[PDB]
């Protein structure tokens, strides 16, 4: 079950990054230019986990060369929740969806992320129901 979806580009705040016009699937726009250092942050629009435990993140994600990764976190930096890696799929507009696990608690959250490497774009996140 479906938590929530944000649009990467519906940040309230952001360092580093440029949005674009997508052709993925539903149109609208990407994040890109992400490099080491550049954050995004969704504190504007927080999240209700419904009770702690496992949740899954969802990624739409793009990238010519691969080698990028991200933290997955609180806005602000702590605490942090996950991290990923980020998978070459053939060019800056060839969209693939990545995923991983992380422990949420209960509670309104204020989810952020942070760029380990870059090399990507991101469409959307979507947060997940495990169990
Ligand atoms: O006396 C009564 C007033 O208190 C009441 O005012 C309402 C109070 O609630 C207001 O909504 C608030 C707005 O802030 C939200 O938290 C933010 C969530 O995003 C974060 O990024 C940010 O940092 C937080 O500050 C909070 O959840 C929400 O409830 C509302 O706008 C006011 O109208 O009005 C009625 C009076 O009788
Ligand atoms: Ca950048
Ligand atoms: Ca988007
Ligand atoms: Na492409
Ligand atoms: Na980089």
Redesign the pocket.
């Given at each position: 079950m479906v938590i929530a979806t944000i649009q990467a580009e519906d940040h309230?705040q952001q360092s580093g990054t440029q949005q674009e016009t997508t052709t993925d699937t539903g149109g609208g726009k990407n994040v890109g230019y992400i490099d080491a250092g550049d954050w995004l942050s969704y504190?504007?629009t927080?999240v209700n986990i419904p009770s702690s435990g496992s949740y899954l993140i969802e990624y739409r994600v793009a990238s010519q060369n691969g080698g990028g990764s991200l933290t997955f976190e609180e806005a602000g930096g702590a605490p942090v929740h996950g991290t990923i890696a980020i998978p070459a799929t053939g060019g800056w507009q060839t969209w693939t969806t990545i995923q991983h696990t992380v422990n949420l608690s209960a509670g309104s959250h204020?989810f952020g992320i942070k760029a380990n490497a870059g090399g990507w774009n991101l469409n959307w996140i979507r947060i997940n129901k495990t169990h």
């Open positions: 309230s504190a504007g927080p204020q």
